[PDB]
Amino acid sequence: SMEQVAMELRLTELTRLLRSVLDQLQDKDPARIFAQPVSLKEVPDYLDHIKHPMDFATMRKRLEAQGYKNLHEFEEDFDLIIDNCMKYNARDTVFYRAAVRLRDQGGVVLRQARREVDSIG
């Protein structure tokens, strides 16, 4: 149907905008602490602590399969990256502190992304 195509075009354009958002958030992580999944070879107890691991590569795979239907879904995954780290790692660690800085800096990007998603529809 033509309606299905129109919906698919909207999803494609959301995917374009989320790709730009993802790039901007990941620039706020110059140390690349959040770039890849926590290695279960190197942290074998991780899943005992963290039930839903997340990282920027995993988000990028979902994104390129057009797997985010709305901004809320995308934000959920970004919040997991932050929140998982702030639980697993103590306050005095470079990991925790990196997550705080990512959250603070990402807030700015996400605020304007929400306006754009609503504005363009």
From Swiss-Prot:
Scaffold subunit of various histone acetyltransferase (HAT) complexes, such as the MOZ/MORF and HBO1 complexes, that acts as a regulator of hematopoiesis. Plays a key role in HBO1 complex by directing KAT7/HBO1 specificity towards histone H3 'Lys-14' acetylation (H3K14ac), thereby promoting erythroid differentiation. Transmembrane segments: none annotated. This is Bromodomain-containing protein 1. Residues 9-113 form the Bromo domain. The chain holds residues 555 to 674 of 1058 of the full protein. Highly expressed in testis. Component of some HBO1 complex composed of KAT7/HBO1, MEAF6, ING4 and BRD1/BRPF2. Component of the MOZ/MORF complex composed at least of ING5, KAT6A, KAT6B, MEAF6 and one of BRPF1, BRD1/BRPF2 and BRPF3. Interacts (via PHD-type zinc finger domain) with unmodified histone H3. Interacts (via PWWP domain) with dimethylated and trimethylated 'Lys-79' on histone H3. It comes from Homo sapiens. Signal peptide: none annotated. It is found in: Nucleus; Chromosome. There is a cross-link at K41 (Glycyl lysine isopeptide (Lys-Gly) (interchain with G-Cter in SUMO2)). The gene is BRD1.
